[PDB]
Amino acid sequence: KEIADIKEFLELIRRQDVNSATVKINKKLNKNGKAFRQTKFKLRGSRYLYTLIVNDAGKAKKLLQSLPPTFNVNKL
């Protein structure tokens, strides 16, 4: 698998070879500065499966809503 970037992620969705995209939640704790959430947006199709790391939960929620209604957002 490759990675992210951001951006390019937005241009990868414009292909529509990439149809679906699962999301994952992984609780981390950078030396207990903050015990933070993180999310992971993975994009299948075809040779590679790409993935973007986003740490802030706020930044993730704006991005999660902004994608098309027709796009199949899988979870876990």
Place this chain on the structure above:
Amino acid sequence: AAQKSFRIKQKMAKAKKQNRPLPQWIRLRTNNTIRYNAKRRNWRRTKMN
């Protein structure tokens, strides 16, 4: 011997099927002098090739 040929495996395929005892309904046939199979093979006693 694991890495065997097709010509060898074809001979051993026969050796499986031929090695079996005499069917009972043949013994009730008319005239018939046969009782047990003479041509029989066990792997420990006798070898093939």
Place this chain on the structure above:
Amino acid sequence: GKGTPSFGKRHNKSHTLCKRCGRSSYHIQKHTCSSCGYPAAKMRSHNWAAKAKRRRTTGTGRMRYLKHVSRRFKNGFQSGEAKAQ
């Protein structure tokens, strides 16, 4: 240890199966059979062994062409078919 210890080392094959004669007597190092003489033109027959011919010569096999020749000769090698009365 010329006897039983040397017998323990025997696990090779000087001879394999043959195409023509169907017998485990095909020398690989020489590229020739001892029984029939494949691959040559002829069958390896010898007058000094009468039993050698008796085991393999005509009559032993199916004779799936030669078996019906005497029947064809007697009738006179016909063509066509019988009609009816």
Place this chain on the structure above:
Amino acid sequence: AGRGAPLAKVVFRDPYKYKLREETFIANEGLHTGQFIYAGKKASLNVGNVLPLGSVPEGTIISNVEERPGDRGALARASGNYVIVIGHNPEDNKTRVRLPSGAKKIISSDARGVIGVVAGGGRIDKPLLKAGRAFHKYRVKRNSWPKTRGVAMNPVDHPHGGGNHQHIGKASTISRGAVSGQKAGLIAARRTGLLRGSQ
């Protein structure tokens, strides 16, 4: 491998094509890598250069000499050996030549010869010591080594062999007019015993 002589590989051009042909020469003591070599009739007299015997003065030194013209080499190819030119003839193109054994020979004037002594000299001087050194010499040549003495053998296996004591029995000096099987010893000997000085 198994040759007392370091070889040399020289690149010549093809006069009739855009190509290169390598030829394997025996290196005379004096050559080096990144050196020019001049082969022909009009070529000059230096170490390495290949000349025909006619365009060479008397008392010169050469090696890899041809018996005929077009033989591609024959006389004097071994280590530390060299042919010396003695004489000349105008009528009949035939120079006089001395071979390294001692016996002289008349060779044609147009035959070739590479100038200089053959490299790797003084190979025979060191003794072999241990038998394993002798093994490795014959290991990269033939199967001619561990030679048993014929007198030690049985009378079946060799003529000299047999008897209660290890002796030959009859004269080891055997004739030229003999047959294969008999010839084991000194064949057609003029002299026998220890020779003094002059060969």
Place this chain on the structure above:
Amino acid sequence: AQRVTFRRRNPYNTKSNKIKVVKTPGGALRSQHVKKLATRPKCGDTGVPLQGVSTLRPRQYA
């Protein structure tokens, strides 16, 4: 502690049949058959290795 086995039948330790032992995500120690190393490209006139060119066995860089 944890012994290992061969994979591709060929039992004899020759070149093109050597093993680097590796820990798995399961936990067991298992073998993996290491490929042969590629020597560097070299100069024509001199016998010096050529700089600014990749290694790779002759077929990998097709």
Place this chain on the structure above:
RNA sequence: AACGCAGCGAAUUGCGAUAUGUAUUGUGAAUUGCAGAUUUUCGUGAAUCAUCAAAUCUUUGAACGCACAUUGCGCCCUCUGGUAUUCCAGGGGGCAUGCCUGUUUGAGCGUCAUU
């Protein structure tokens, strides 16, 4: 010579993916160890019958495209699929060597006539 084929067979006896046989002709009711039919039983017809003139004939072998301790690897014509003169697969037909008779292209100041 190998490998297969019977409703239930391992061998022997028969036959070749049309496989203990199909068509054709004759005889006129069986086969049979146990099943099972088919009703064909005043018939263009039972049968492990006799007969035998039409066909089928796996892979081989003098064995023939080149090989053959390999079910190895190619080339040509032709129809059908996948977008196809060239790539992939499928169905069909072909490609050995020596020698003879002829046919068509040719090679040689070997040699003849004509510009």
Place this chain on the structure above:
RNA sequence: UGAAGACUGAAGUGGGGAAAGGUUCCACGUCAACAGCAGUUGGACGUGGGUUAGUCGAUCCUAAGAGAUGGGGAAGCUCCGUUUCAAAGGCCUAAUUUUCUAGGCCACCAUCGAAAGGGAAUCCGGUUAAUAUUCCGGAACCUGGAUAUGGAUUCUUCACGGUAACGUAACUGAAUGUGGAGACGUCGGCGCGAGCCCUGGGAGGAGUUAUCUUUUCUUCUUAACAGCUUAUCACCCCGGAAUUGGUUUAUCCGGAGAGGGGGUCUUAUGGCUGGAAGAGCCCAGCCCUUGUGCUGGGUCCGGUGCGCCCGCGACGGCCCUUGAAAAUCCACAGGAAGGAAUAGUUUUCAUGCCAGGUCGUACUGAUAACCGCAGCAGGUCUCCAAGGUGAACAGCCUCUAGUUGAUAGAAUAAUGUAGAUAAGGGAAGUCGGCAAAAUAGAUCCGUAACUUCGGGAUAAGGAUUGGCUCUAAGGAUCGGAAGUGAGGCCUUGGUCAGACGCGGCGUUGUAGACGGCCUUGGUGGUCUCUUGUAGAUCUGCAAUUAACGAUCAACUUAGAACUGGUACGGACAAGGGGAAUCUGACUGUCUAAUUAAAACAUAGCAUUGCGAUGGUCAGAAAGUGAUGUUGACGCAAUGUGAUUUCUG
């Protein structure tokens, strides 16, 4: 099946393969024979079930070799020969746009031969009574076909950058020629990394507990593949070296340009992110006839080394030994031909589409699946390999894993077989010290004739070794006491976002913790006091060498005291020594199953034949062979048998 005792002891009674066997693997039924006792058990007997590949092999290339064809032999079965005294072909582009014809270049040549050599590309987790790198789930990669979107390139064009080593995501190139990879021995130490071993703190579970032990044991793991970083060796620019410098364990290098300062490159190997925590392992708790789940938790942070074993790297010894070939893929020289702007070139790059045949794949690999007439103390090619003792892959004792199989019971006569000990003497035995005894490890002392001065040599011959408590020496990392303006914690002032949770049927109401940036002062010794405490935990003006301080960490080598039934390499393991004579110099080799030697071989020495139309030798014959991919410092044929010394 349970419980208790045992052994093999990781060079194994462990886990997998090669040759060879061929269903012996696995389930259900069942004991007439076979398993030299027995049998309810079985590798037996009866009836079925079982081996799934583009990536692992075979297939393909060549090796020592084998072997058609053209030719020449032989009455002939066939023999020689493989590039030859042969007219020995198959590879690319158009023409023509019926798909058949035209361009061309180039040329001593079948075919078989390796399941350990060469070689296009796959890994983790799950699942079966018996199969898996081959099925299922998830993530990759190659070769051969097709092909269009984006990007790049183009007014003078087939890109620009850097002094240079070289760089960038891409960046026309035929005939022909040249170069690289494929492609290569061994012994030695030094360095780097993997895995295991060892060990500290925590987070769980099991063991022990009359008494003692912040402990005895175990779990805390991370694949191929994608991306960005990291190196000894080489190499480029600057500059000019004897008071010669730099430098390895190992002495090599420099006006053919060293040291010093600054760079470029191969990515072997590590690090971080993706893979990927959703998986696996380890606890705790719910139901549930079954099938099963379902629900919480945790999966963390380090240290050490002449350690063991494997790989990689730069170096150094060896040789009258210098340690395979071809298929196959790439690069450069070279300029053939072909191309634009109202548009065209590129498919050595980014994405995207289709396809991947044939055969092998079970199990055993041996004191019971192979060979030895057999379930025979025999024989038969390999890989992985823990703890303690110790020089040690020696012997002895454990852990993991695997067996507990080899007819049993009762008494203890002679004679046996295998092990043992013995008063005084010490080879008197016997053909003969045969057999058995004694010596043995380490450290220090001490060492003859003779000698080819290399050895003899562990010569001979003495002394010491335990346990416990101490002392001495041997290393690696990091730090200098004072003179302002500027960037940790706390506070002051400015400046900017804003986490989550809950309630009515995606919506609508709703509290709302906290984070960094910017910048002035204060913060071990000291005093105020009966006593202090927090962090010494960014530039200026410029003091110093042994006179030192902190912090962590190995195992070696010396010396001293005390102490015992004078014992201490306490078991295991481990040379008897000396003075001569005959003989072969030495290491080496042979009579497989009565002879291992003084026999054979050997280096060294000597003799004989040969200049290719030749010597020695094969063949029935050949337009045929071996030495010979040879040429007298060579090839062939014999004798003697190192050195010193002589050969009448």
Place this chain on the structure above:
RNA sequence: GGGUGAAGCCAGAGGAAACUCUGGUGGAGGCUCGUAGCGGUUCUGACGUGCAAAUCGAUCGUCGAAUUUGGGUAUAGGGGC
């Protein structure tokens, strides 16, 4: 796994000089003690209608090369080696 310590290098001491001694470093050899491996000396031990048509035990030789061994290939009976 030990023992011995050859060339090649570095430093010192003695001497009027020619040179001569001493200490390290280094790791040579068909060297040497000994495990697996390969062999088969003695007990004229065990067994000798055997476990075995050549095995069993203890004691022994050699153990980095004239070494030990797998697969492929060559040489065939007055012939081969």
Place this chain on the structure above:
RNA sequence: UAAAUAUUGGCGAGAGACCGAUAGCGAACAAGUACAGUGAUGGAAAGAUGAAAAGAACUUUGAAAAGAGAGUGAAAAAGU
């Protein structure tokens, strides 16, 4: 260039002062078969219940095999 002449092989018919299952072909039977050897090759043993299987239903002892009775048949002194 037919005929009179040959013939231990092949296809089809006749006979015998010949052998009678250790004989006669090696082989009267699933014989060039089973089995041995790396290989050329080597190479056995084995015929007969009764006219008809009518091949022993049923009881009882035994874990079973079998045993005692019974029954079939001219005979089980014919029980595969």
